[model samples]
Target: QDITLYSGRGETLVKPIIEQFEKQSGIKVNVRYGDTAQLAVLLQEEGARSPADVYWGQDAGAMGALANAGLLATLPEAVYKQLPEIYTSKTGQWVAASGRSRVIAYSTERASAEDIPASVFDLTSEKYQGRFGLAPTNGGFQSFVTAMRVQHGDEKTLAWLKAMKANQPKIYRNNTTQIQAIGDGEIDFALVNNYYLPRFVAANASFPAKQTYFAEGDIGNLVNVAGVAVLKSSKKQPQAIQFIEYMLSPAAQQYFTSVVGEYPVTQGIIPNPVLGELDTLLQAAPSIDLDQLADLQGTLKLLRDAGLL
Candidate 1:
C-alpha cells in the first residue's frame, strides 16, 4: 500500500522514519513537510482534493483540531492499550509519537547551575530581567502557556507572562537562535526545547549548553507531545494506520530516540548515548491538552498588552 503524508515536523525528523516504514512494510511514502499549524489549515482548505492520508508532526493540538473536524480516523484498540491513558486520545483519533519538554538552557560560564531560576515565573525577578531569552511566537511557547493555564489556572499564568514581559527578556524567533545566543553569552539563559540541546551538541561538537528544569513541580514543566493520525477520508486507510503503528514500534522508537535525539514513547526503547543521562522523571509535567490552545490566544493578548508582542 502507498500513502501520502502531510507533516509539520522537519524533514530531518520524519524522513528517516518514513524510509524505515517503506523498507519494512513495502509501502511507498510521499511526504510534504511544513509548520504543523499551517499544514492543518492547508489540509482543511484542500478538502476533497487533499492527497494526504496521514497527518504527523510537532503539534498535537493541530491533531486534535483535525480530529474535531472529522479529519482523523479512529486508531486501533491494541495501539490504544499499549500506551498509558494520558498518552492516548479518548476517541482513539490520534496518538503521540514523540515529545519535547520546555527547558532553560544557560551558559555554564555565565551562570552556575545552582543559581538558575527556581521557576519560569522567577525569570521576572530583577536579577534575571535582562539576562533571559525566549523563542516567543512559536507553537512550543503557545503550548507552554497552555500547559501553565491547565496546571496553575489562567490568572496565575497570565500574571507570570506579564511579569516576564516586564523583565525585558530578549526574544528570538525560534529555539535555535535562543540557544545559540545563550551559548555565545548574548543572553545568560534561554528557554528552549530539551531535545534541541543534545541535537545541537551532536551536530556541532563545541556547542556549549546546559539545561535546567523549571518550577521543580508539575505545572512549571510544560512538555509538548508530537502526534500522528490516519486521516478519516484517506484513500489508503490500512497503510496509514500501519505507518502509525510502525512508528510506535521499538525499531522506529529507537531511531527517534537514538538517531534524532528525541525522547521515545515506547517503554523498552533505550535513549541514545548522548541522552542516556536525562532523567525520565523530567517528563512528569504531564502532556498538554489541546482544549487549552484557545486559552493561549488570551495569554498572547496579555503579552501584547505588556508590549512583549
Candidate 2:
C-alpha cells in the first residue's frame, strides 16, 4: 500500500518519521514538500483531483485556510482530544502535530533580563530604536500578527506595525536567521518562534540568545501549532488517518519535543524542560482562536501597506 503526502515541513525533519511509518506499516510513502502557503494554494487549485492523501502544514494559518476552503475532511472527534484545545481547529478539519509559541528572542549578552519589554507594543520606545529584530514575512510571525489583528482590531494592529517599523527594527529572512543574528550580536532582540532558540541552545549552551514570553495573555505570546489534515477527496483516507494518528503517538511526540525542540501537542510525553509546560504556554498565549488567524491574504496586505513586506 502507498500514500502520497503533501508536506510543507522540510524533508530534513519529517523524512525520518515517514521512514519509521513505512518500515513498521509496510505502507510506502511518496512525499512532495514545498512552501506551506504555496502547497496550500496548489491543493486549493487541484481540489478533488489532488492525489495527496495527507496534508501537513508548518502552521495553523495554512491548515485553517485549507479547512475554510473545504479541502480538508473533518477528523474523528477523538483525535482532537489528544491535543490542546487552543491548538485544535474550529472546523475540526485538523489536529496539531506540534505546538510552538511566539516569544521575544533576545541576546543574553547584549540585553539585561529586567530591560526586556513586557508587552510587544512597548518595542517602539526610543531605548529600543534600531535594536529590535523581526521577520514580518515569516509564517509564524504572520500568524502572530493575524492573532493581533483578531484580538486588537486591524486599526490597532496596523498602528503597531507602523510604529514598530518606525522604530527601525532589523529585518531577518526568517526565525532561524533572527536567532543567529541575536547570538552574533547583530541585534539585541527579535520576535520569533519558541523552537528556534532551543536548536541553538542544545548545540551550544553558550549561545547568546535566549527566549522569553510577553506578559500573560498578551497577543505577543500567541501559541500556534503545525497541523495535519486528511484531504476529503483522497481515496486513501484510512491510510491518511493512520499517518495522522502516528504523528500524534508518544514516539512521534517524543521525537518532536526532544529532537525538533518543539512543544509536544499530546499529553504524557515530557515537554522540553527548556520550553516548560504545555499548559504554561497556553496560559501565556492570548485567547484568539487559531481559525481566526486564517486570513493570510489580509495579513500580507497589511504587511505590504505597513512597508514590512
Candidate 3:
C-alpha cells in the first residue's frame, strides 16, 4: 500500500529528503503539505476516517495536540529507545525528525549588538528600544512563549512580552525575514531558530549578523523540534513505520544536518561543526516539558490580549 504523508516542514527542506526516500526505498509516499496548525486541525476534523498514513509536522506543540486527541499512534519501543529523551515525546506518540534551538540573532555591524543581553528579559531596556525584531505569531516563537509559561508563570512571561512590545519591536511573520531585516540594517536583533542563520553567513562571509543564546539555562534558550508521527487511522502501518525508521537512519539524518542546518536527533550521527555538539546545545535550554508545550489557546489569548496579534 502507498503511504500518505501529511507534511508541515515546508517543501523547500522536506521535498528533497522525501524524494530521496522514494527513489531509495521503492515505496511511493503521497504527501499533502500545508501549514502545521491547519493540517493538525484538518486531521482532527477528518477524525478516525482520515486517509493519511504519516504526519511529518513542524511544531512539537501540534504533535502534542494530535496525541491528546488520540490521533497519533504510539510508536514501537524499538523506534525511540535510542534517541535523545529531550527530542522524543514522553508519550512516544511522535518523534522529532530534527532539532532546533531558539537563539537571539543580532547584527554584528550595529553598536547595540555589541552588548548581548544575558537573558531574553533584558531586551526591554530603553537603550535597546526600537532595535528588536520579533515574530509574535510564528510557531517557533509561540513555542518559545509557551516554554516561558511552563518554566516560569503566565504572568511573568506576559510581563516580558508587554515590555518587549513596549520596546518597539519590528514585527515579522517568520524567522527568515527577521534575520534578513538584521542584514538589511533595519533591526539589531531577532528571536529566531538556530538553523536560519548559517545560510546567510554562508552566503556572505560578511553577513552582518550572528546568533547566540540568551543565558545559561534561560527560557529563551528553549530547544524544540520539527516532529513526525503516524496517524492512528491509517491502514498503511507497515509502510508508515518504514517511512519513520528511514528518516532516523544515519544517511537521512546527515541530510538534515548538511542541507537544512538542523541537529540530528539520533545518537552517533556525524556532527556538523557549525552546529557544534548537540549536547552543548541541549544543555543551554531550560528544563521544560516538550510534551506539555501544547497550550495554544492560552498563548493565542495572551498574544491577543497583549496586542501582539
Q: Using lDDT as the measure, which candidate wins?
A: 2
lDDT of each: 0.75, 0.86, 0.84
Weakest lDDT window of 10 consecutive positions for candidate 3: 109-118
lDDT of 2 by residue, 15-90 (tens): 9999999987888999999988789989999999999999998877777778889889988877875566777876
Off by over 4 Å in 3: 111-114, 269-274
Pitting candidate 1 against candidate 3, the one with the higher lDDT is 3
Clashing pairs in 3: none
RMSD of 2: 2.0
- The better candidate by TM-score, 1 or 3, is 3
lDDT of 3 by residue, 54-147 (tens): 9998777878889889999988888877777777877688888888878888888884435777788888999789998999878889888988
**Candidate closest to the true structure, highest TM-score:** 2
Error of 2 at 270 (Å): 2.9
Segments in model 2 whose C-alpha atoms lie over 4 Å from true places: none
